[PDB]
Design a protein around this ligand. Sequence first.
Ligand SMILES: Cc1cc2nc3c(=O)[nH]c(=O)nc-3n(C[C@H](O)[C@H](O)[C@H](O)COP(=O)(O)OP(=O)(O)OC[C@H]3O[C@@H](n4cnc5c(N)ncnc54)[C@H](O)[C@@H]3O)c2cc1C
Ligand SMILES: Cc1cc2nc3c(=O)[nH]c(=O)nc-3n(C[C@H](O)[C@H](O)[C@H](O)COP(=O)(O)OP(=O)(O)OC[C@H]3O[C@@H](n4cnc5c(N)ncnc54)[C@H](O)[C@@H]3O)c2cc1C
Lengths: 458, 458
Amino acid sequence: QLDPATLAAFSAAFRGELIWPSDADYDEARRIWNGTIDRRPALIARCTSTPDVVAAVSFARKSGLLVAVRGGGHSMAGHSVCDGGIVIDLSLMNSIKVSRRLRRARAQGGCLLGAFDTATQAHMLATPAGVVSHTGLGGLVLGGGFGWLSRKYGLSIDNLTSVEIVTADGGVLTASDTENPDLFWAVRGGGGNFGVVTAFEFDLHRVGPVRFASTYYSLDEGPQVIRAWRDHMATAPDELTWALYLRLAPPLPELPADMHGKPVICAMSCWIGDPHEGERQLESILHAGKPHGLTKATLPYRALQAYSFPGAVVPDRIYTKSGYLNELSDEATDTVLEHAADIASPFTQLELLYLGGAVARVPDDATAYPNRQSPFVTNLAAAWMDPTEDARHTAWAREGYRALAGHLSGGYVNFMNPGEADRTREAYGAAKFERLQGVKAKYDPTNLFRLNQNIPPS
Amino acid sequence: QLDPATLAAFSAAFRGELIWPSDADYDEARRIWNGTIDRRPALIARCTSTPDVVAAVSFARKSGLLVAVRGGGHSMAGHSVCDGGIVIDLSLMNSIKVSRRLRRARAQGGCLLGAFDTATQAHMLATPAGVVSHTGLGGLVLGGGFGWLSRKYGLSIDNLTSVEIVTADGGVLTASDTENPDLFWAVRGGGGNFGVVTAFEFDLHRVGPVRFASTYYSLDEGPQVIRAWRDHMATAPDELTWALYLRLAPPLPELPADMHGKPVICAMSCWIGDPHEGERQLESILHAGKPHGLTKATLPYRALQAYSFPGAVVPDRIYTKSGYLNELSDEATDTVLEHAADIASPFTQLELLYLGGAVARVPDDATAYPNRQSPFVTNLAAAWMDPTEDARHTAWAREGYRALAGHLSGGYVNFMNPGEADRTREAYGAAKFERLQGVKAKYDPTNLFRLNQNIPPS
Ligand SMILES: Cc1cc2nc3c(=O)[nH]c(=O)nc-3n(C[C@H](O)[C@H](O)[C@H](O)COP(=O)(O)OP(=O)(O)OC[C@H]3O[C@@H](n4cnc5c(N)ncnc54)[C@H](O)[C@@H]3O)c2cc1C
Ligand SMILES: Cc1cc2nc3c(=O)[nH]c(=O)nc-3n(C[C@H](O)[C@H](O)[C@H](O)COP(=O)(O)OP(=O)(O)OC[C@H]3O[C@@H](n4cnc5c(N)ncnc54)[C@H](O)[C@@H]3O)c2cc1C
């Protein structure tokens, strides 16, 4: 419990909504996407403006509260809710200003991808982000951020030009290439370690309809499909994006009844460019195996962003183990095929992603984001509903990771699970981590922002 | 020019951004979706909160300025921008709160539909709205609001539980079925006539994946297709929505190149319900003619919302003529088909829509929205780029409306064009218009809010 004078000064200065443990909406407001994370904050501060974040940050500093920051709540490590502290909740700060003439967007730190993509696509514009519309822009960008447009236009952070950020001392800074560039380097891949970003400014690109295809392959054909994918993507043009999701076949009308609920490869591909060139490019990779339940469409980019994933049935409980690879050996391929065959939940996916492209043409040290040179990402994304089944699904993710871990290097900070705080050094590597620690010593010396993949100062 | 003490009082109490005619942003901020409307306001006030709106409304009243209110800026009459007045611009108020347990959404009056649907679909919830993601929620709901979910769940206003509204005198009111119910009746169909809605509260429904189909028919088979559409829809279950859009075929790879740029019927259909039943219901309506470029998919609802329209081009200039039909005779069908063959712009649509269903089962006098018992809507929506071609496109819409005038009645206020201020009485009918005038006499007696399909007080 808190100082009255400190709390009263906070309440007068705070324009947003405060949510106490006794309030009706406390239980829904403290839930985040990873439902296995059950925590009880002392206070949830729903900010509506940059002055609100300044007041909440100062309040937390003086009062000694543990600080959780929440954008869209999608932390796979559960960092956006704390026990006994304050949640600086940005979900009500989701305004977007788009300039069609300048090809610029200014978005508040609480935006969801779908709101952002709606605003830019009102002008046939877009900039890279993740593939699920209700992910938060805040956490996604600060870790790097990749999706459909990334092989063509880079990570989200490769299109970011400045941020407004509230630092631990309550001061509001602007960071960019011309102002506080040490800070600007660190927020592009260093997470929420350095303060609360209340505004992101992006460069946008013209993105009209995209030819898109999704289809399913029998695991019978697993070896030939994954090897075709790995070989083709090594030399594919930047305009082609092709991703593999190993999962149980959803009970959908386009799929034969005898495939429902059985392990399959779900392959999703799109061409960022001319749709007629796209139709020719996709037809030539869709028949690596016999395609079942093939869906082909020419979609507005916003509808591509909203498509993922097939089945659309939001899971309650999640556990992820992820890593990068430099190559995908035959030994690795048979390992992922064997564990795909043991998937138990219809909501679990073993994701095989290929980045590279424009992501890999940015020099390594240009941003805080690591592993630009590793084009492969594997993600064992277990998801389920029943809390008494946690061990079964968590064990699938862990045993698959361990069987693969020798082939893996690094790790995407935004795919880390609640027990992977120790993976931070191996994620960034030694030189980036050390540079990150020096920025942290300058801007967050007391480590006030430690619910993240944390970088201790000095 | 403005009295400097009133202006300083406004600027102190206003926590948003003011955009003056001398500012660099002025020309982009005063543009609205309908590019034929070129107006220069004295001031654009970008509000960030309900108190911002209160200050702007009170500043406009005291200064005698003409008030334009802007949500998403999609007014087909150009009402969201004014010459010499103030634009009360809500585009930055786009925050949404969703309660999964209570199945409820609270959205600010500046929201765009895509932002709304992203927030609700994070919980697999939805409530009816329009078919294009970057339409503003504010104007659409105040005029009624229909789209994919409407035959099943009604108009947007049929799911509205309450509003927070800033009236002409500067007061903030709540309106619901138990609090100011005369105002709550009028805002549900009466447009912006009664004040600035800063928050809408909605009931939500669970909407998982939906089977969807879009395809194209030659006008050669046009009489067979339209007759099958009007016959089938008279007795179709609520779960089926089927819409026809007569247009030039977009140059998409799913269509044979010899159809590109020639008039066709674009037919879009969905089943709000089980996708397997949806696949059977859709297949039963897809073959009244030979379907070309057939796209079939099982989509998350948010992706269905983001799909329209094929080609994903934003036109700069628009002109619309719309009315309702109680029946669609064979003679009207021939008139529609002949007029469609004359379409010149690739962005023009002659839309044939069928509402009915849940829309028609709400008692006529339960809301201010008129014509619930007319199932058909036709919208001659001309759209183009070149400002030297205005006359030809505008004349296409007017001549088609005049050729159909024997079959048309009423009119949707949200489809009115800039020259249709006179149609307000015919749209609502005498009895509804008179009662609307009595509510207006009470809440906006000076007709402060007149940039809308206007209802004079008394
Ligand atoms: C279903 C799903 C799909 C995903 N798809 C992708 C994908 O396609 N591509 C991809 O790259 N990632 C993807 N992700 C991962 C995503 O990038 C991370 O989970 C990210 O951290 C989520 O951001 P958030 O704001 O929603 O999360 P939150 O839980 O709100 O926050 C995440 C972290 O960032 C911090 N943070 C958030 N907002 C701010 C802010 N404004 N200022 C400072 N710190 C902040 C929080 O303190 C926390 O440490 C996906 C995740 C999920 C669950
Ligand atoms: C491409 C396109 C697709 C469309 N599709 C559909 C569809 O599927 N279904 C449908 O029913 N309609 C549809 N519409 C029409 C739409 O309902 C109207 O154009 C609506 O008025 C647009 O709302 P807005 O806030 O974007 O418009 P604006 O131009 O910002 O405002 C329109 C009117 O509403 C008033 N207003 C707006 N917000 C508020 C508020 N918060 N409080 C008070 N008054 C307010 C304004 O003063 C003005 O009179 C479509 C329009 C377009 C251009």
